[PDB]
Design a protein around this nucleic acid. Sequence first.
RNA 1: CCUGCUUUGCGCAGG
Length: 216
Amino acid sequence: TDRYEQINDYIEALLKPRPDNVKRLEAYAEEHHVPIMEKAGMEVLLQILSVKQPKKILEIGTAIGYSAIRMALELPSAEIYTIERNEKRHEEAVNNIKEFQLDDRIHVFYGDALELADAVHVTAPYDVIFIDAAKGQYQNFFHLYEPMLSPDGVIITDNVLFKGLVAEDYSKIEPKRRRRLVAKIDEYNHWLMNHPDYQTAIIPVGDGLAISKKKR
RNA sequence: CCUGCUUUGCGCAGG
Ligand SMILES: C[S@@+](CC[C@H](N)C(=O)[O-])C[C@H]1O[C@@H](n2cnc3c(N)ncnc32)[C@H](O)[C@@H]1O
């Protein structure tokens, strides 16, 4: 283990216990290798949300519903619109949401987010947009959905550090597919951090968070 | 085998 790992493990060990039902979702994801947000990142996301107190949240990338559920439990008034392209995950998410009795406030679209803008627009604007899908597609999601953000909204992108690979010399990573993806995330970070219409900060927690707030 | 897709890490589209 290195510093980065040790720090992550230290944070996870300081966490307050989650409710048994949330614990079941975490254990399922771990058993089944469903990617779900890492624990330390999720806590930071939640705290940012608790400060902001958004009314409406758009999430790209539901998986089995874990991050949407946690957000909704943190924000009992919020409505969440989430998108998942994998039909089996979509089904699991819907079923988990129903078990938590949150289906009145969390609504899960099936399909590729790049093809669902018209649907999502019906319930725009969103005070928070959380991008948590498809490594190679962040800029595309941003351009498609940023016009739907409320005035003082925040856009949060997950997985902007790719295990630290983005911050190293990655020029000889194999296979090439992976090298190309790391380069594409590095590109996104540079593009988004340079953007004069947003104030963005990178948070090196979990897989790395970018928090972008739209200026006036 | 190699190149593109998919995946958090065997099947398509090419050479
Ligand atoms: C890392 S996971 C989601 C983690 C989830 N937010 C959580 O913590 O509970 C990424 C998910 O995005 C979905 N996904 C990938 N590309 C997508 C796209 N273009 N549109 C919609 N969903 C997508 C995948 O099927 C996968 O379930």
